Design an enzyme around this catalytic site. Structure first.
Site, PDB file in Angstrom:
ATOM      1  CG  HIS A 128      -2.067   0.943   1.117  1.00  0.00           C
ATOM      2  ND1 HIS A 128      -3.242   0.751   1.811  1.00  0.00           N
ATOM      3  CD2 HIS A 128      -2.225   2.084   0.409  1.00  0.00           C
ATOM      4  CE1 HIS A 128      -4.073   1.738   1.531  1.00  0.00           C
ATOM      5  NE2 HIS A 128      -3.485   2.559   0.684  1.00  0.00           N
TER       6      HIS A 128
ATOM      7  CG  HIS B 136      -0.200   6.881  -1.268  1.00  0.00           C
ATOM      8  ND1 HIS B 136      -1.082   7.570  -2.065  1.00  0.00           N
ATOM      9  CD2 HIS B 136      -0.949   6.139  -0.424  1.00  0.00           C
ATOM     10  CE1 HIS B 136      -2.318   7.277  -1.705  1.00  0.00           C
ATOM     11  NE2 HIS B 136      -2.269   6.410  -0.713  1.00  0.00           N
TER      12      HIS B 136
ATOM     13  CE  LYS C 152      -6.718   2.239  -3.589  1.00  0.00           C
ATOM     14  NZ  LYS C 152      -5.694   3.172  -3.130  1.00  0.00           N
TER      15      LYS C 152
ATOM     16  CG  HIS D 206      -8.642   6.212  -4.231  1.00  0.00           C
ATOM     17  ND1 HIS D 206      -9.381   7.265  -3.748  1.00  0.00           N
ATOM     18  CD2 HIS D 206      -7.678   5.974  -3.309  1.00  0.00           C
ATOM     19  CE1 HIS D 206      -8.890   7.651  -2.584  1.00  0.00           C
ATOM     20  NE2 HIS D 206      -7.855   6.884  -2.295  1.00  0.00           N
TER      21      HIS D 206
ATOM     22  CG  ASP E 143     -10.125  10.673  -3.328  1.00  0.00           C
ATOM     23  OD1 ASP E 143     -11.144  10.402  -2.657  1.00  0.00           O
ATOM     24  OD2 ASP E 143      -9.080  11.110  -2.802  1.00  0.00           O
TER      25      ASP E 143
ATOM     26  CG  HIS F 296     -10.320   4.223  -0.876  1.00  0.00           C
ATOM     27  ND1 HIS F 296      -9.384   5.034  -0.264  1.00  0.00           N
ATOM     28  CD2 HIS F 296     -11.529   4.727  -0.539  1.00  0.00           C
ATOM     29  CE1 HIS F 296     -10.007   5.987   0.406  1.00  0.00           C
ATOM     30  NE2 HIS F 296     -11.307   5.825   0.257  1.00  0.00           N
TER      31      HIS F 296
ATOM     32  CG  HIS G  62      -8.230   1.851   3.903  1.00  0.00           C
ATOM     33  ND1 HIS G  62      -9.540   1.937   3.482  1.00  0.00           N
ATOM     34  CD2 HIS G  62      -7.480   2.380   2.909  1.00  0.00           C
ATOM     35  CE1 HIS G  62      -9.582   2.479   2.279  1.00  0.00           C
ATOM     36  NE2 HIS G  62      -8.347   2.758   1.908  1.00  0.00           N
TER      37      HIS G  62
ATOM     38  CG  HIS H 272      -8.889  11.581   1.100  1.00  0.00           C
ATOM     39  ND1 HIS H 272      -8.346  10.746   0.145  1.00  0.00           N
ATOM     40  CD2 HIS H 272      -8.986  10.846   2.230  1.00  0.00           C
ATOM     41  CE1 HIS H 272      -8.118   9.561   0.676  1.00  0.00           C
ATOM     42  NE2 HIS H 272      -8.498   9.594   1.940  1.00  0.00           N
TER      43      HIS H 272
ATOM     44  NE  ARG I  89     -11.742   8.233   5.272  1.00  0.00           N
ATOM     45  CZ  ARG I  89     -11.057   8.636   4.213  1.00  0.00           C
ATOM     46  NH1 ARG I  89     -11.669   9.287   3.232  1.00  0.00           N
ATOM     47  NH2 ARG I  89      -9.762   8.380   4.136  1.00  0.00           N
TER      48      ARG I  89
ATOM     49  CG  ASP J 212      -2.860   4.740   3.055  1.00  0.00           C
ATOM     50  OD1 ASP J 212      -4.037   4.791   3.475  1.00  0.00           O
ATOM     51  OD2 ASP J 212      -2.489   5.326   2.018  1.00  0.00           O
TER      52      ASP J 212
END
Ligand SMILES: [Mn+2]
Ligand SMILES: [Mn+2]
Ligand SMILES: [Mn+2]
Ligand SMILES: [Mn+2]
Ligand SMILES: [Mn+2]
Ligand SMILES: [Mn+2]
Lengths: 566, 100, 101, 566, 566, 100
Positions: free
Chosen positions: E133, E135, E216, E218, E220, E245, E271, E319, E335, E359
């Protein structure tokens, strides 16, 4: 016209007859010769001599040097002279008088459009040091050594592993190939040593065929007469050097047995004094033989007040010994002898010991090889006065004898003297510029293969390169491809023939070792003495011709607290 | 903070100065690197306070005396140079023969 | 004890010995200062300096290498010249010779 | 629906009519245009617009941009507009409206699966700076310059050597080839300058054939009319630029003689004000000619309280002059004139001087080219008010005039404007993102060839990239092969044809220079003024059309003590 | 002869039946087996066993290991045993009894001239961690992770850009190719993830063909059922893994809709607890399905006193949310649930959650994956006592269950278990040596592909490698070509076939992923529980079989203030 | 200053020691890295003052006591080693079981 000698020195550096103090020591050098023509010196700057049609000619690149070091005070085993140094194709072109033949007399080093200039007036230029006792424990050692002035590093290791902590050995083909590849990333000339402790010749030949320029016989891997004889047989047939760290325990025999197994064949004895290892307590007697090329590791140079107290723990950690295991602590103590430590200093002054090395992070300090050699020289002058070979009122001969210890002699011993080791035409341009006040301690410029690799550098954002903070930072000669083009990876003749550089895809220049078997004690420049030396088995006293050899421990030394922040 | 490489480099000079400053305090005769760091750090804080270049070129010569440093040290430092951000930007301060 | 100190022996150095020399009276007729280098071909200096250029042919200043001689506006002074050697081939400067002589 | 202008700015950055203060200066910019469609702005984040089927389309890579900078406030010589910037194949794709054509109107920059996103709302985007006066004294200069926002570096040098300390010259084929190879390790576009001081054309041609994109004529190497004429002849035939540092001593003639030798041929005059070198005291008069492309080195920008006091010593060290040699100190002083220093600031404001450069570590500060140009702009507004060309109540024209000084104009002058210098489609993606509070001082993001090369970065182990300490660290665009793919090595047309990149085995992208001979003063964007300027030989006063030109020294400046730790 | 158990442990490390405390935790391990022959242990040092004709044989390189780790206490999912580890060709050769077959019994790992030695007696050896995970915000993350003991890094990103800050996606061919090239400069095995949020399969296939080993999805970028289904279709046909995600906003549907779109196809849920993202508030229920491979990001491990207070702001920054925009702050709060945070710890202890990841810099700490997994283990022992599977009076089973979380399980999930993930013959030699007092915190040695890449290192100039200051410095395994030879770049089967490594001219070893679609919850070593778990839509309470699941927040933890300077 | 890589490395040890020194001053029980830095820096200044190796190997054991450091810390440090420039050059100082 006419100019006073003082103003002359302030402008172009010292000339014939002037003396210069080396750092804060008691050693004085005197300019033996000056190759310039008075009034015709080349100087660079605004309105100076090196300009079009004046000190700079009209010749094409092929007809002029690439780099010229103006008004340099050269200190080498062959002389202490004032001259201009010319560099072409990464190699030492000439040592003479630089300028424009069109208008100047006696110009031997032509300056043209293609010529870069380094002002060396008032500085001392020497060849780059060569440490033949490196433990590749970490790559950071190269930067440390380069900053101190050592441009070539020979040794072995695979990194911070037990084997490497204790011995200078790059075990086998895989680790050899890996180190040969990793060497490309380093700003110093490199040569690897393999593990020579085996009684099967093919196991040694593979390593030589894989790329090592030598074989290390170490007692931790078993320095038995069988192992020794085996390594020497392969060395003899492949023209590689053998470095030995004899049997301290006397387990397989005494020093005489080891000497007998060697059988009059060429060999390099590491830390011949013994504190760093070797037959207890007389391995030091080896310096009496013609086939032995003896060297000292730096922590015992020179004999000082804290030397002994320091050594015991240092011994333990390096060799993975146990302070609780009686046998492990007794053998460490049998290794540290005040007697032999004191004698070593003197044996150097006489030319009985011919080399100085570090033994990096395994009972040695990587950046103190040069620094300590000069500290020994200083202490020997102070205690013993002038050498029998001195002429005039200077220490010129003692300087030639000591500088050869970390330059030419190590280069001869490992068969790379054809490439490096001194400032002679044809050799790679590995030079070091020093300011007289920092000689042997902190270099002004460190040149590698014709390009500056590291130098003191001030504020990157400043209007000039001198504002604080000034500390050593890497230059262009240490960057990617420029680095590859300016460094050498020494291979064995066999590895070269096998096309190892092509297979591993090594990017640096390749040089081959040769003449490792034919060198002998007598070939060691200014250090060829073979003394009738004896060691008392009980009292550990060292005697040469019956006379007692010894020196006193120093309480304070030069090139120490006056130059370092920590 | 967004520290540039130069601000980070001056942190080295500052730290080196803390070393020398403590030693001078114990009454030691400072060595070469110690002296340089001590006088250089003095000038930087000079700029921070807003002192002019001319003022500092003078005051810089009164930081350490010949009896506060080791033998030979004064002669090893013919001048000291450092740059700092004055209210009117970066400027170069050159102190000639700082130790007398 | 001074680290790296020199111990220059007393005396003097004779520069450019065994070479033809000559003195020339030079006057700066310009309104701006002019400074000349040691190895610069004198006969090709700034045209504002008035002197017998014919005598300074193939000559340079008889001063220690790397030094200069300044001439403030309207200044007049006598200088000593020493002859070029080597091949005596002058290339560059104002491009008045560009060859031997 | 409807949204207030304030809330709009806080969400998407300022729009048409809003004004923004540049850092802590008095300069205000006003958004001249906005290319978005209100309500259709693309924004990235959780639940934001840029998502599958919404602001992101279904098109393949070939049909969408690789990188989009959303809601950017562009500041360039051509305008100060709000728009989205699209980047494809490492180059500026388009300046328009980004999004998904499937559901959004006026989309010119398509966002797809292959599109990375950089949020630029509330930030200012500019082209990367171009410093054409670099002294390659140390490689660390590139990181310093890149962090300041300069993505291209042109100059010469071989490292910390006397020649390089004083001049911007990479002497000859060997040193050129070495620097061209070392350039691959650097995160900035590079172009080398050779030593142009020679009266034999073949000696210059070899250098151009070896790879230089220009020739530096420097007085330290003899800036005689013969040397000048020679370099210009070869320049004319090989399409390379010539940078000049004229004869300060007036040794070969006055400024008019130099001008005469140039003979109306294109040339770039370094530090045209003279403090950094040039015919004393009127080299500044050169800015009046059409074939002269004039630039200023940064230490004299802008005229402040400590400028003079600082200059004398700085002069000495750079040019290897002697403070004890009278002639060496008189010529240094004849170079520093309050009169010309003050006039330079104004000549910039008028467009008489067209470029700003550093002159890195040789009377210049590598990381202060951008910072100082804006400090000059600020001081000129404060002292002289609005320019005659200003329209509206903002400083938009003064910003376009000053930004062009370190972006497009330097790019035109050295023949690389076809590759870089501005934010225009087709040009390499060398962009710099700034936060309005740190404009010109400390960049938010520095993009090179489409990849972020350096950026402020917090705790590597933190849960977000913002925790302290935050300082500039290298990113992926500065790593090995990614770096090679994102940087350019500018070669001369000849070197390109000779296959120099193949022979040296250069790994980066290659670009060729062209159009160096055809540029003239009139081509300098927003800085084409040719004033009837005169300098008084005695009083050193600068006059344009008889009127006196001058300014006052600043005691405090913006972008200084408020942003720096030291 | 005979030797007491204590003296034996001090000399060769603990043997069968001895227990060892892991760092300063309450976890105890007990040696389950010892593969040595008492009295025949190999030890290296002066006068020790590993010497010519003794513990070292006469066999050629091909017949002996390259590197041997003597007397190692192995901790792996398969056992906690004492043995010698042999390494040949950069891979795990054997786990047995090392020595010389000529004179020693039961020798399975032959030691020869070509054998380097690492003394592991009294140390714990484990496989290198694998963080799935990552980034890629900055390259400095690799050094941070490597120092912590993680040798493999999978994730996505292009650097510090908005897209990467929020998601683990390397968008498209260009950015993929660039990252694949930049990966060569990094000392860890790498695998990239592309942006899988698209409803057009060809846009996903290009990315897989460009080189990604996964996709991935996601929120977003829009985690809609259409996007999800699309990525899973391409995954199924190209044998790559999908990381998800989910939609926190419930915008396209609830957790059950997402589960339905997935349709029983293999997938890795990031997660799974939800704080790091996912359907609010029950994404945690996903751990009940057989096609779901669940993992936790580290900031919520373990539940402590400051966990909650810390999370809100952390959420916002990652985010790109707005604290002033009500909808942006409500969704951040929905969350963070104390209830699910507490339950996560227990679900791990039971084997319901099968992986632990970081992450990195997007709600996760890159160098705390291992450290936190053990902190959770400790807290669970303290609160829940022994597991039902424990045998004997030790925590051996809990250690095997937890170590598998950051080693084998992540390797199985992403289809690279054939290359790494555990200490088994044939696997790449990515090992980590730990001192019992620093287990999980600060490693003694970090080995990569058979070469030490990073290790604690003292004064480079010291006489031994132990003097202060000691801090992690890069070793030879992280240098140029040696690094390339010791690291892997994982490609998709398609990219491999397309000759992507040849086109991009990647220099490292290439490995291909396979078996991503066939893995299921049941394959997760020691973590295959599929609980009947429910979450209360109002109270957020987590229940397994109706019983309430929960734990208490820790005020103090081990492997924290006792080991760190800051 | 012309700082070599080793002088720059010791600046790290010195700075780490300033951290520990301040914490000890607030009356905190020092942790592992803090203790090492504090005792190591003590020895370096010992050399600077001119104390002999033997003297320091002793004094080094009286810098921090068992009641001044966290639990387990003394056992985590069986010995401490550091090198500094004594008047007679660089020397290694090994302090066994520094914390009692
Ligand atoms: Mn040895
Ligand atoms: Mn050794
Ligand atoms: Mn100049
Ligand atoms: Mn310049
Ligand atoms: Mn997420
Ligand atoms: Mn994430």
């Amino acid at each position: 016209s006419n100019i006073s000698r003082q103003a002359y020195a302030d402008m172009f550096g010292p000339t014939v007859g002037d003396k210069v103090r080396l750092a804060d020591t008691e050693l004085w050098i005197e300019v033996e010769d000056d190759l310039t023509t008075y009034g015709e010196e080349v100087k660079f700057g605004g309105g100076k001599v090196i300009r079009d049609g004046m000190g700079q000619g009209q010749m094409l690149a092929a007809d002029c040097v690439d780099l010229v070091l103006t008004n340099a005070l050269i200190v080498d085993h062959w002389g202490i002279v004032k001259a201009d140094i010319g560099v072409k194709d990464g190699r030492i072109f000439a040592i003479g008088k630089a300028g424009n033949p069109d208008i100047q007399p006696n110009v031997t080093i032509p300056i043209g459009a293609a010529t870069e200039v380094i002002a060396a007036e008032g500085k001392i230029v020497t060849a780059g040091g060569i440490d033949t006792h490196i433990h590749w424990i970490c790559p950071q050692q190269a930067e440390e050594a380069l900053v101190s002035g050592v441009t070539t590093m020979v040794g072995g290791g695979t990194g911070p592993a037990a084997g490497t902590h204790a011995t200078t050995c790059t075990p086998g083909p895989w680790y050899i190939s890996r180190m040969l590849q990793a060497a490309d990333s380093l700003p110093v000339n490199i040569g690897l040593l393999g593990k020579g402790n085996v009684s099967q010749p093919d196991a040694l030949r593979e390593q030589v065929a894989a790329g090592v320029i030598g074989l290390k016989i170490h007692e931790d891997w078993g320095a038995t007469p069988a192992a020794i004889d085996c390594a020497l047989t392969v060395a003899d047939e492949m023209d590689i050097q053998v470095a030995l760290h004899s049997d301290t325990l006397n387990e397989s025999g005494f020093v005489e047995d080891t000497l007998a197994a060697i059988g009059g064949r060429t060999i390099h004895t590491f830390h011949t004094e013994g504190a760093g290892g070797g037959h207890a307590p007389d391995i030091i007697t080896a310096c009496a033989h013609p086939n032995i090329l003896p060297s000292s590791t730096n922590p015992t140079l020179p004999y000082t007040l804290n030397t002994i107290d320091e050594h015991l723990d240092m011994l333990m950690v390096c060799h993975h010994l146990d302070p609780d295991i009686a046998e492990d602590v007794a053998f460490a103590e049998s290794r540290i002898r005040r007697e032999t430590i004191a004698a070593e200093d003197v044996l150097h002054d006489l030319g009985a010991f011919s080399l100085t090395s570090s033994d990096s992070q395994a009972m040695g300090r990587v950046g103190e090889v040069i620094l300590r050699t000069w500290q020994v020289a200083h202490r020997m002058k102070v205690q013993r006065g002038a050498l029998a070979e001195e002429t005039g009122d200077n220490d010129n001969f003692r300087v030639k004898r000591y500088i050869a210890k970390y330059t030419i002699n190590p280069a001869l011993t490992h068969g790379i003297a054809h490439e490096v080791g001194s400032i002679e035409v044809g050799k790679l341009a590995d030079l070091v510029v020093w300011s007289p006040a920092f000689f042997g301690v902190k270099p002004a410029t460190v040149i590698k293969g014709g390009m500056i690799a590291i130098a003191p550098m001030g504020d990157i954002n400043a209007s000039i390169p001198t504002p604080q903070p000034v500390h050593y930072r890497p230059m262009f000669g240490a960057l990617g491809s420029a680095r590859h083009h300016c460094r050498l990876t020494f291979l064995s003749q066999a590895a070269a023939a096998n096309g190892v550089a092509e297979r591993l895809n090594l990017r640096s220049a390749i040089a081959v070792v040769k003449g490792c078997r034919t060198v002998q004690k007598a070939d060691m420049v200014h250090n060829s003495l073979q003394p009738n030396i004896t060691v008392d088995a009980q009292t550990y006293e060292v005697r040469v011709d019956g006379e007692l050899i010894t020196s006193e421990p120093a309480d304070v030394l030069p090139m120490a607290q006056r130059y370092f922040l920590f | 903070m967004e520290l540039t490489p130069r601000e980070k480099d001056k942190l080295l000079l500052f730290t080196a100065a803390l070393v020398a400053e403590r030693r001078l305090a114990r009454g030691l005769k400072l060595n070469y690197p110690e002296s340089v760091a001590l006088i250089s750090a003095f000038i930087m804080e000079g700029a921070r306070d807003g002192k002019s270049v001319a003022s500092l070129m003078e005051e810089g010569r009164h930081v350490l005396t010949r009896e506060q440093v080791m033998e030979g040290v004064p002669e090893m430092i013919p001048d000291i140079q450092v740059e700092a951000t004055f209210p009117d930007g970066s400027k170069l301060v050159t102190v000639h023969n700082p130790i007398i | 004890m001074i680290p790296g100190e020199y111990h220059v022996k007393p005396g003097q150095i004779a520069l450019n010995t065994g070479r033809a020399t000559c003195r020339v009276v030079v006057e700066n007729h310009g309104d701006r200062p002019i400074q000349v280098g040691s190895h610069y071909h004198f006969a090709e200096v700034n045209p504002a300096l008035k002197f017998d250029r014919q005598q300074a042919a193939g000559y340079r200043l008889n001063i220690p290498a790397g030094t200069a001689v300044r001439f403030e506006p309207g200044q007049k002074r006598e200088v000593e010249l020493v002859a070029f050697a080597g091949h005596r081939a002058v290339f560059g400067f104002r491009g008045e010779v560009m060859g031997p002589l």
